[PDB]
Design a protein around this ligand. Structure first.
Ligand SMILES: NS(=O)(=O)c1cc2ccccc2o1
Ligand SMILES: NS(=O)(=O)c1cc2ccccc2o1
Ligand SMILES: [Zn+2]
Length: 258
């Protein structure tokens, strides 16, 4: 794998090694709020994170992942558009070099400063590697970030970043409560899509919350001090690690709210 977000290996290049990049259910997409239909059949989401066990934070060269113990049903997503139970495996963000870009989904073409992805896999397939091969294998909860007031529950993540500056570095990250990253409302849009980094597999039910969370300038500035490169290599700041909106094709975005 030599894909990235640089000048010569960014999203417009990915198709050359991952031809699914030009598929019919790629993500992210623009959410046209006037075209998205309210679906009175969609249920409230069930976010059950009381028992979550965070373990480690990793700079993988394209973002940082906060990893969870997904060996049992401790932090799960159910309900909403989903059948069955999806276990939280990791969360990560995508963000910009400036506040005017960074999110992957857009809302009536508006870009947010960043987007959080809480990634879950369908326990009927037993492990994540099997789940990504299935059209209903994953559920990703996407949450927009705007810059304004600090997000108190994000600060513990921000403060550890200085210890995982470069690709391949990790740090123990236990006892982190991902409930502190949610907005007040769980109203959402949903549609069938894909992973947004290679392998770009078409295995995700996307659940994108309407209400952004607020983070401070200082919090997002610390995201932008991370590096894409490894230790001692030429410094490439980890910024603009987002894929653009892809064609919606033959898909409907449904709204949980009137
Ligand atoms: N198609 S790709 O995975 O994004 C990829 C782009 C690319 C550019 C230069 C060298 C290796 C590369 O690998
Ligand atoms: N950015 S995402 O769609 O949440 C995503 C999670 C994920 C895990 C493994 C490989 C690609 C991935 O892409
Ligand atoms: Zn993501």
């Amino acid at each position: 794998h030599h894909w990235g977000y640089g000048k010569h290996n960014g999203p417009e290049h990915w198709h050359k090694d991952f031809p699914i990049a030009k598929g019919e259910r790629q993500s992210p997409v623009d959410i046209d709020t006037h075209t998205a239909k309210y679906d009175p059949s969609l249920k409230p989401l069930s976010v059950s994170y009381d028992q979550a066990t965070s373990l480690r934070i990793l700079n993988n060269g394209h973002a940082f992942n906060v990893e969870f113990d997904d060996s049992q049903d401790k932090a799960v997503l159910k309900g909403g558009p989903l059948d069955g139970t999806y276990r939280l495996i990791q969360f990560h963000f995508h963000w910009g070099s400036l506040d005017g870009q960074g999110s992957e989904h857009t809302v009536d073409k508006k870009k947010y400063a960043a987007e959080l992805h809480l990634v879950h896999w369908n326990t009927k397939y037993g492990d994540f590697g099997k789940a990504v091969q299935q059209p209903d294998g994953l559920a990703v909860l996407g949450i927009f970030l705007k810059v304004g007031s600090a997000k108190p529950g994000l600060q513990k993540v921000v403060d550890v970043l200085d210890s995982i500056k470069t690709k391949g570095k990790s740090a123990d990250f236990t006892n982190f409560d991902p409930r502190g990253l949610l907005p007040e409302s769980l109203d959402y849009w949903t549609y069938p899509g894909s992973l947004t980094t290679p392998p770009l597999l078409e295995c995700v039910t996307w659940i994108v919350l309407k209400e952004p969370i607020s983070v401070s300038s200082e919090q997002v500035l610390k995201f932008r001090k991370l590096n894409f490169n490894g230790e001692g290599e030429p410094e490439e700041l980890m910024v603009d690690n987002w894929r653009p909106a892809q064609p919606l094709k033959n898909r409907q975005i449904k709204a949980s709210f009137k």
